[PDB]
């Protein structure tokens, strides 16, 4: 399936259209959190407009409306022209910005679950452990309430490994600098999660989650990845959209702790 | 050895099988702490139901018969059918979790031993030293556990490599942050320990193992590796089953130093 | 394509299976009551394990997942081989009794609709129009009663041809004599109701449905019809499983008129 | 395009010459401290004296002519006689001399922007945000003051990954060595900015800057990199000019967080 031919009338040849998904996907990569320890499942296809969930409460099973996720961006057809004149490769910094827009989409809804569609999310999702942090700002307690939700995940068959992901406040304050020590709170941290820490804007304030990170627990179900559209022209210009088809799946909810804050 | 023919009435195809194994394969080495520091004694075939096993003690020879570990999973058909006839790639994620409890039964079995089939474990093999550990909550008096039990290992010709295998409360506390100090107990300990600090979830409370990684002082005899059968069709489904026989054998109990709580 | 090759261990060869077929079908074809004024929208097949429907209230599109209904019956290998030794074709009475019962469900499922999977009915279906009947035993209510549903229908913009189910006591209400026109009510609701009226036991009491007949306000979406499926052999016996996959779509609930006994 | 036949007077030939180009592009590499985080608006060549920017300020389009930065060097006749006379590879010493002036050059219009070609750096650019740093002398202030900083980056729908340039004064407190503490502060630095912690002798006394490494956020226009060319004989001697036309181009001003000195 060539997307030349799929667009007669797009502006951008072959060359030019497959620079376009390497911009898209190389900046949506760098801001995807939840795709880097949460599996796919695989490309399921335009055949498949919703997905099955078999939820295991520690065997329910629902039905999942994939949702769409898209931001359009604008090519200047006088820019367009000018770079076929001059034989460059065109420019493609708008299309980054809308790939990390999505990308930001796909992890609000991992994290937080479609409203509209109800979908649950990783922090709302029905039956799944909750941990209450202390004052992360001294010193031992960040390390402490992690042992105590992992301590939790533990007495649920669930041996890891995990993956935790935290706000960008609670985050700041796991690499902060202590006063009467010096010590490094991530490197104790991160041998208990091997999967890895990972930080998300889409947590707000402080906020956190544990997840085990096994496909049985919860996967990334997949109809159609980062791909790019032509709207065809408006005003003389070339729109362009960036949509992906992905809904987060939680086969066993147990396998979450999420952080919260007792504010 | 076909699988597909193996199995004429199997849904799975040659393709459909590998990908189960590999799911298989890959949930239960994920799970196996066994395996990381004790050899195999290769593929020994179904025409072994039984290996022998010669103890030295610093050499009695003794019978030990090949135990089953397994676990039984069903793939639906409504599933597997909608899979073939959109040409995806199916979901395992049954699989995995089959995989994984089978793993944890190895592990159980290795440390533990089995209790029906009279195996010695890890962890109550007749003749092995045995080390009374401090509180581990205060600083290096888990390095001096570790040295001492090391050095009752050192008394009996074993110079190791050795491996140390903890209980996941001890473990967190090797990992935890101390106050008065800013010392990562860990850096200390897996000097000394070469072949590698790992922890199982099948040991509880505040226990621990170190083992000399050896193939002359123990191996794990193996009959048939992680297996996928098909059990035939049962209520239009298709239930599965992930076996595997193994046998841990400790030639030389002497190279076990047991740390145990004093309660 | 034979059913033989589809289950190699079914000890039922070509013929038999051809016989087991029809016994289930005939069985279910003089059960069913909702199909005969439902259009069918399929088989989609097995990769359909779920339904889109588009509601038109009088737009909101809801994902239905289809159910899978169905009943089992055995068939004893001591009454298999006694009808082979003896050149007997194989009684497959039970077949009926399982098919009737699925057939059954369908209808159960069509009307009432499935709490299950919260899929509505004929009779549960929100938006649909109610209309609270009279006394039927007196004469001239029964067709008048019919006349304004119709017209709640007409105001709707809906003009036919509509299909009339009742409970089977209101049907044979129907039969009786018009006070003036000295002709039974059932000829006078006939050329009203031109896709035909029918009865089913799944309404009980003063009961009916007044449904707009076409594909656009609604059609059962089908994935796998009435098939009769081979479990695998149990104890030397042979068990079966008569199985079929339906869900019901009202693309349009204004269409449905109900009858309501106050 | 050989170089050899564009100057047919020039004493180097085709070997001779690439091996001016590897001096003049490695003694560069060195030194360029912008093109560590900012990525290249390929080879727009030489039919493009001038390239568009479009600010986006949280769409303003101006004009940038692409300035020349270029530094002359001389290779004295009677060195390169003798070098062809005794067969060996010529000496570049000053060529690579010649090549970091260059490289300093596009540094200091980089972070400084053109004065004459109007042309806005990245510690002078129009809309960006400001963070005025504590006594970075201090134990934790220089981190606290980088989380500031960051946080106001935050605040602009700006998630990373984030570039840290400092003057070499705020470079070397960053790694100087506390007293009462052995905190190694920008290991604590690093974590927080991941694109990387670099120091440019451009910037002066105790500043810095904060830049996303986005190409949507900023860009450099290179009409052509260093390339090194002959101007003729002059006193029998073979000057040279390594030169290079290069614009820097900020679409998001608001990606940039410059660190002053409040003096």
């Given amino acids: 399936m060539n997307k030349s031919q799929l667009y007669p009338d797009s502006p951008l040849t072959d060359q030019d ?21 949460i599996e796919l499942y695989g490309p399921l296809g335009r055949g498949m407009q919703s997905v099955f969930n078999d939820i295991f409460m520690e065997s329910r099973r629902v039905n ?12 200047y057809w006088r820019d367009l022209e000018q770079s076929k004149a001059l034989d460059i490769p065109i420019d493609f910094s708008v299309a980054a910005n809308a ?13 937080h679950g479609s409203k509209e569609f109800d979908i649950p999310g990783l922090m709302n999702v029905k039956g799944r452990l909750t941990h209450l ?75 956190g989650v544990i997840v085990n990170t096994g496909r049985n627990n919860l996967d990334l179900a997949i109809s159609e990845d980062f791909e790019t559209a ?25 396998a979450i702790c999420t952080l919260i804050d007792p504010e």
Avoid: C
């Fill in 17 to 37: 259209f497959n620079q376009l998904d390497q911009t898209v996907i190389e900046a949506a990569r760098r801001q995807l959190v939840g795709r880097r320890f």
């Fill in 64 to 75: 999942y409306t994939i949702p769409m996720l898209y931001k359009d961006f604008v090519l």
């Fill in 99 to 111: 790939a990390r827009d999505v990308a930001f989409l796909e992890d609000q809804m991992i994290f």
């Fill in 133 to 207: 942090i202390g004052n992360w700002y001294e010193s031992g307690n960040a390390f402490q309430d992690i042992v105590e939700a992992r301590n939790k995940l533990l007495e649920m068959n669930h041996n890891g490994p995990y993956a935790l992901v935290l706000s960008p406040e609670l985050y700041s304050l796991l690499h902060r600098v202590h006063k009467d020590t010096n010590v490094l709170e991530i490197e104790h941290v991160r041998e208990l999660i091997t999967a890895g820490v990972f930080q998300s804007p889409v947590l707000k304030g402080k906020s």
């Fill in 230 to 254: 032509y709207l065809g022209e408006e005003g003389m210009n070339h729109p362009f959209r960036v949509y992906e088809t992905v809904v987060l799946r939680i086969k066993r909810p147990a």
